[model samples]
Target chain A: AGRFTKVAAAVADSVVTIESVSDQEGMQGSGVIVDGRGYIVTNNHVISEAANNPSQFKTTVVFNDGKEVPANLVGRDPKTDLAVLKVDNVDNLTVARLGDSSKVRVGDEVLAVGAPLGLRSTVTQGIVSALHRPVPLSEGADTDTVIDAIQTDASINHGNSGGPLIDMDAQVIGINTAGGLGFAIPVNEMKLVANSLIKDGKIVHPTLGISTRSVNASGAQVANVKAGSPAQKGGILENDVIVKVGNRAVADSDEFVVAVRQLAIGQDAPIEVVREGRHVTLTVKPDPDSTLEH
Target chain B: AGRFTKVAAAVADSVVTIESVSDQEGMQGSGVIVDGRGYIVTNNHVISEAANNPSQFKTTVVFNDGKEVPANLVGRDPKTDLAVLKVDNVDNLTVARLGDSSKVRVGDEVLAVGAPLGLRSTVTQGIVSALHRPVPLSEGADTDTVIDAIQTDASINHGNSGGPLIDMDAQVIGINTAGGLGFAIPVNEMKLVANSLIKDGKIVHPTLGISTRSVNASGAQVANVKAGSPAQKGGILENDVIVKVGNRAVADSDEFVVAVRQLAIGQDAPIEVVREGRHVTLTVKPDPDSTLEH
Candidate 1:
């Protein structure tokens, strides 16, 4: 026996198999039971194809003991690519305890928990390859949306999405999101997004109503500011080049949106801009109502 | 601040880059310093492409300190897929201490020390995935050449061959040979094979003078027994089915050959056979000269 025996025994029951069946085909992924009342956490893309049309699609959760139960779509956030689901009155639900990912050190032993290549409850171990490994979802989408992920070489493959990256203490520290350069979204970030998703059925990301485009490969050039919106009140005008939000650089238009999301609703975010080739700074109060329209 | 710091520091200096340069291109793998006099150990396949024409190809060893020294082929055991190299007059060489693979527990953190993807001295860590994993290479070429491997998921890839897989204490426990189901030749077997290769530049395996075939799935069918050999002296005749060698079962012709290798030359190995549909056991001394002819 090795070190993972206690780790496996402590966590295995909480890991569940998530299956999404649509009119076209069926897809499988892994999920972790986070709430004793039957709330399960999974990846957005795992159920995205089916979630597109909720009526024509079905989502099921299979427990470690082979019990299958229908689940409800609590909410999904494409920005972080995380989704929450729930099953009604489930007996013998195993809930995983989440740990602080910020405490993880480079070279710390990490185990990836999931169904790799459709093998359910597979656990692969490796050391933390690195911290804050920058992984952009795609080139030029939103650099700010790129998670500073936990990197490990723990044999994470397809179908491992949303499964926990647990520490030796058997605490869930991250949620595995990708493989090949095995990446997991840090649990700290997941918790920040997940709490809102579970409580409100969606995340309320702070935003200022503005349409913008990349300009000079340096900053987001403001294209339009909504009438009577926070952008208008904050003195954001058309062609006012947005350079920075708080201390985060707005290299592209999408970056500006992601930067704004980091601020809490009603929080005052310091914004920098280039007005007619002149540097200027302004303060904007984000509106929670922006999420309503969003 | 993880478990692998001291482990990595202890092993890094002993790890070296092995490059097999030919007329066409250069193939790179990893190795470890095994002796203070500059003996390096690596995979046989790493140098086999060049081993085919040692005169036409050149092998080089690059130290952790960035010194490239020309190496000489000391010996190689293709059956075990391991090879040794020597660099003359190399100063400040660090040799790795071999650990007992039998003592390595499942889930003991093992780190693969090698250059992967041609990057030198790179380290990846994982627990002992398994032990004594039986692997048969390209069946029938040499049935006795099956390797009982140590399994790990430590991201062993191209250029990692011949590198040392060390335990948490930094003692070399295995020599990584292949990947996909990443396997390392247990250091126990490596030491046994290495001693012979380092001394005689060849492995002397005990053998019975007989050409055998698989009769059924369960036994080795003797087709021909050489005249004036141990088999003749032991009353072993052709067309007899071998059922067991010593205490090991002869499950197949390959298993019989493997079982024979376990015996020492000049030692009596009890061989059980089905002769004319009757069970028979005979003691046969493995001829030392049989290995000479082989």
Candidate 2:
């Protein structure tokens, strides 16, 4: 958004390494910063599963340059499929500032910063098509709760994940995540996740421990709820129509997810569930949805 | 497949119209023919919505082979949203050979032959990333069925529609339908439509008069069956999961569409549908679907 020279100069030392493993089984499209504050942001597909097995696929991060540095997976949020990493022995660090994603509209011009095709520091431009896009997680990753994404036509290819979607203010509003029509997780959402990563070296997202199915015209319905879980114990049952989560109207499972995931761990929230065409509200205290934690 | 020289010779005339007129909104993106057939294929979209209000969007076609031929809209199909034009009183045309689309594969070498950004007869090459991809239909041109598509990474931009997607055999296996990752309707799928358009001077597709959703898991699901239509008469109700038509599996409602559109007028197809967790079979006689008379 600024002079490519000035911004690229500041980012060069901070935007460091991208350790990737690609192909049929899936690759770790990880990103690293050189001389950064020993922390990394990467696609959940990159290091999340690697943390689980530790044997099949190994995970590592590097500097803003092209060097791989040793790192450990702190914790990841499958709802966003974004994992944060920690590294020791760093010189200086570059922390990206966050922008208000709600201000972005369809066709708003934006820039995608990422390492497309494993090439470091590639940037492309395009207009945003839609915000709050819910791309499902059927590609054998983690949870399918990702929502509140900014869809762009910018050229974001493989290895672009975990980079910044910079605005004219040089602030990051979205994280360059999945691409090809360019879907980037809202930076506002990531800031919340990053807070947990920094505070406890792990994420503690609220999960009712149930799967919700998206109903096209019939409305969002709870598909499955685990017995003895807070959702079921709190009178939330399968096919229970979720009318509202907190103050937001629940249209589909995706919106309901974004609303639920926004709650802090152990926080109590009011959720209305419709049963037999009747709306019913109840207070549910959510537990740590340590989903995908190995 | 024909000789490379023959197909190459054919393209010089049959592809790309560099200009159009506001007076003829139906022919906004049109092009010429170097081929002997003296026919042109343009997007059905250029001619749609204006049908009921012709004066609103004036319609016409042009050629780039020096002579501006007055074109008559021969046949149009709303299902595929493709329009064919006839250059009346013509002789000595260089018709391109329609190649086999089944031969196209991901990463198989190919070329995008057409006008790009109004640049006439531009050729760009890129590997095919996918085959039989279902691209989201643009515009409200009323695409009735799932479009059988070819996906390529070839650089295709505005003004490339209705051009050819050629294989190493140099035959036209697909037509450039739209841009952004390059989506093309397979030539194999276009054959019957082209034949109907040529023979009758107009095309009609019989619909059950309802919008069925994709049975495929790739996209949004909306299955709203119209009342008293053939789809309903066959006991195909709303949320009736269409699993397959004949032997082809209906992965989604889109697959059902492409399959139904391929059904010849008056031909019956046995359909397998999932309703209430049970599979049921029904025979459906597709009526001639048409939005305009020949």
Candidate 3:
């Protein structure tokens, strides 16, 4: 027994094995029960194929007791790679305790519990390797799915996706997503997306309503501003190169996108841009994208 | 300031930059002062080229105070990737405090201080990721130089080799060596090699007095045994497949080599083998290889 022995034991019941089979292929992953009502949180990629093709897909949730139950996809947010599942007629499901990711620091001990290669309830111990590491989960997609990831070196592999990265207090700090160089989506961000998905079946992202491209040298060059959008209302024009958003410096279009997404909706944020060889600062209040509220 | 601010400050002066230039090229690395008399510990590969051709190579040590002084190689052990250097006529050298590597655990906050990319005194924070990870630093070399490394997620780069991996207590627990996936030679193992190198310029490894190869299915197949050596004296014969060395299981030739290297010299250890489809256990006291001593 090691230092994480008790921690692993405490969260053992909450971690579960998820198997979703589509007509094309099958996918296996891990998830954590977040609500006693059988609400489980996992990575969207884990069951995307099954959820996308419901008619040809079958999803199953296996509990620690080896009890297998049919589960339905509650909602999924591909941009953040998070999803929620619900299993009906199931009782006494152990809910994992969520931790404040804001308090997570480098060197904090953590355990990743999952079913790697179908080995259920396997736990690997490590520490927080890095914080606020921007990881592009989906590349060349319509929506660039980037995660401000919490990096760890704990052994994560295939079938470990969606498992809980637990802290010393047995609290969930992040969701294990990618493995090669293990990365996790911070639980705080997961909570935000999970709650919205559970309520609206989609994420209501805050947006400046402007498409931007990387300038040849630096900054994000505004390509277009939507009509009646916050960018237009805030006096942002095409060809304006955004250099800074709040206190974060925008290096390129990708940085601009990530920086804009981090802004608080309905709150005034100072956006600095280089306009025609002159530096200009403007205030913009991000608005929730009502168009995504389906 | 973060959690490691004070820790880094405490050991700032102890970590030094090492530059070695051979006739072909120049190499930069980091080193930690281990003795007030100016004995520094770093990775052997950092100064191997220069040390190998002393006539054509020049080595210099740079202190935190921007003091640069010429140094000479004390000794080097390629097997453990550790080397010792001495700077004469230097006073007031800050010696880094050594820690017990055996007490290091997963999630322990650590800072890697080195001159990465020639950037002197750069500190990166991370946690100990794994322990006792056997890493082969030299591949396809005459002698397999393997270190049972302490894996960390700390940002180690090219010039970080030979830098000190400091724990929260500001103690040197490991020496950062490789970076693609950061690996440090454990301080405990380093101390043993360092002490030997400082005294004898070489390592006296404990041996089973037998050469082995991987069996087709499992275990280590003995190919040759030295006459009147430990194995022969202990009633061990050729063609025996080593299944276990004391408590450690020998699955292949590599495991057998690692297990044998870990045994205490002149101490009796139970060796298990498969001979003629039967399991047999024999007691053998490992002997130190006197041939390695210069």
Candidate 4:
């Protein structure tokens, strides 16, 4: 348990057990410190019960050292199922370092640290079982938050939400959100969403507005081009094959969708499509009302 | 329990007893944690006994923390010989990390961790016997999922099936699937298959439209390129040798296929081929319905 011991100890203080008292319910979850100024990151569901009804809510953060401080909701995004909060007058705060989730591969070692079933500072061990595992949206769930999660068996349960899923180096690679088998929002994606959430309290999802299917193993086949949308506006025609987004190759609809949604609003994304068996580059401007428009 | 003693201890709790009880037999095997929400990764055969006789059989998972929970078979892919199971009312679980099987080299130190003959928390140490060593398919199966398995002499017995063949860093690079000479499914293949299984309960693999045979230790000679497929569209003609896939060097057909399938469907995959004695780059797109539309 050497690495587990070190990993748990290194990040445990940064992982806080959050309890929210609201007019409707008293809920608990986990969180990771992202700022030395007492800012933390957690799942939207963990604090939404309080966040939505800010008038009758009191959110408290309990550190590993038993210090409990009231926290304020900074912002939340149902689309990504993430929320940012800040605590008042906290000192000597330990924050977790974010890691590059893209470097994580299947079979890599991971540790899930959270408060499951109200058990604070609980730690579980597991492997990176799978990557980019698409978790379907629940009924009434935001389509934007159809998280392509990192799958693990590290025992994330109720109250584990909003916690940190760490690597052997004690870096926070994901946030424990929800899963039947445990799913975490990749820190790579979370960093993007969190940055936006911190600045604007929401994420503006962008889209090119094109229907695509898998052309093979390395490209997406454009099935239809939406008129008045970014794809058609950018001169993308139907039957075209999307081969690359920026410098990254579009391997399929999954990668394409992820890449497309990752773009900021109003950003011009360069796309390479195979048209009439010829490779050509097209620039697509983000749409605000399309299928994935911000 | 030498250099990996602490690492093995750190993961022991992630390994659990997978009991498949049927009227005909009561079989006890091992499984590793793949998620913290009680999702487990195990061998298809370990759960197949119950899966095949669903009405008369039951599968139960016994955790290291001494908790017993009923598990539901989320999905299974026989071609890859892997299965996923789900349980309820579980928390505080330990998960394992999956290492890159491609990075694993021959003679690398490995630890085979599992419960053999119901002896829970068992560990054995050895070295990688070989890498990319193709294991023949089980009779009457597709050549697809024919893994370039991580061969080891780490004493894999019957009950060890579905456990982890761990690396020195405590990452699970392979699943202890089958053995006569102790063969495991490399984590690379398992990652792709598991992603599909978790998404659709089956795999819809993508491929390039070229058929080839291994020509040397470094490349595969393109035998045939299917018309209307990604290969022909990318200008990959017959007799061209695939020397590299993206930035990764290709050593043979097995490596080529593995690299190709690892690609997400409908994306652009850059290929470097030797044509007319000169290396050239070609981009191939994936076709969803076509096995390999050239």
Clashing pairs in 1: none
How far out, in Å, is residue A120 in model 4? 8.1
Off by over 4 Å in 2: A1-14, A20-35, A60-65, A90-97, A116-122, A139-141, A216-218, A264-268, A290-294, B1-294
Each model's TM-score, in the order given?
Answer: 0.57, 0.49, 0.57, 0.48
**Candidate 1 lDDT over residue span B1-294, tens digit each:** 566756766677888888776655566788888888888888787787677776777888888787888998988877788889999998888789989988988888788766422432345776788886656653113223566688887767654667899887789999987524578999988888778888888876676788788873258898899999889999899888898988888777767766786787888889998988688899899876335634
Instruction: List per-prediction Cα lDDT, in the order shown.
Output: 0.77, 0.62, 0.80, 0.74
Highest-scoring model, DockQ? 1
Relative to the real complex, the DockQ score for model 4 comes to 0.02
Candidate 1, residue B264: Cα displacement in angstroms equals 3.8
Which CAPRI category fits model 4? incorrect
CA deviation > 4 Å runs, candidate 3: A1-163, A167-169, A173-294, B116-122, B139-142, B209-241, B250-255, B274-277, B285-287, B292-294
Scored by lDDT, the top model is: 3
Q: What DockQ, between 0 and 1, does each candidate earn?
A: 0.14, 0.02, 0.03, 0.02
Better-scoring candidate (lDDT), 1 or 3: 3
Instruction: By lDDT, rank the candidates, best first.
Output: 3, 1, 4, 2
- What is the CA-based DockQ of model 3? 0.03
The residue-by-residue lDDT of candidate 4 on B198-292, one tens digit each, is 77766666767788888832597899999888898889999889988766687787677666755668888899989887888999877654343
| TM-score: model 1 vs. ground truth | 0.57
Give the DockQ of candidate 1.
Answer: 0.14
Instruction: Quote the lDDT for B40 in model 3.
Output: 93
